[model samples]
Target: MKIISISETPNHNTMKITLSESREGMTSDTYTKVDDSQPAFINDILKVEGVKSIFHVMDFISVDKENDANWETVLPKVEAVFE
Candidate 1:
């Protein structure tokens, strides 16, 4: 499934994603960093176009995009991460 929805701030530098599935297992842990240490999908998201930071907890992922990045180019790439 694709992303259920996204929350964007007024500043537009950061956005949050609510996923249809959980990348990480069912746990209360909040991941503030992305690497092989966490789920591979987390690392995958961070490597997408214009991605800066990743905040994933359960089915929700919060992303900080590059200041100059456009959503058109960035979104489609990140959408492929889970699959």
Candidate 2:
């Protein structure tokens, strides 16, 4: 799986993530934030049967207008898990 986009919702409480499966290509079905306490929410998504890996691109914008640049820098390390 690979993340194509990450957009922040207007409420700022959730982010909408677009993911593409290696086999399915780009998909209309996407992921949304589920819990504030669960930092490894992506892991939950991966737990779904048939998912092996992820290629993520972070494009989430904060309420303060700051972007999550850290996720971009760490994306490769994150993808390493699936490898």
Candidate 3:
């Protein structure tokens, strides 16, 4: 997994987006229709809990972990979105 860090204002919630090189890939017009058949592919993880904001790009998903977010809880949910 690749971890990208973003700068945030002090005291503000900070999120860490974890991207896997294996997870990143290309998207076409049919992304919505065929995304389900594929696993480990996500267009975005901005909606995941604790995601303050996204600040980078990767093959799979870009995420923002809330200041208090837990990866154990967050990763599974993010995985489900792509599933």
**Top TM-score: which candidate number?**
1
Model 3 gets an lDDT of 0.45
TM-score of every prediction relative to native:
0.72, 0.30, 0.39
Q: Which stretches of candidate 2 lie over 4 Å from their true place?
A: 22-83
Record all residue pairs in model 2 with backbone atoms less than 3 Å apart, i.e. clashing: none
Candidate 2 residue-wise lDDT, 1-83, digit = tens: 45566665564323445545433334322334334443354555444333333333443212111143344434444345435
Candidate order by lDDT, decreasing, is 1, 3, 2
lDDT of each: 0.75, 0.40, 0.45
Q: Point to the candidate with the largest lDDT.
A: 1
Winner of 2 and 3 under TM-score: 3
RMSD of 1: 3.1
lDDT of 1 by residue, 1-83 (tens): 56899778666877878988875566554444565677677778877879878766777877888899987888778887756
User: TM-score for model 1?
Assistant: 0.72
lDDT of 2: 0.40
List ranges where model 3 is wrong by over 4 Å: 1-44, 56-60
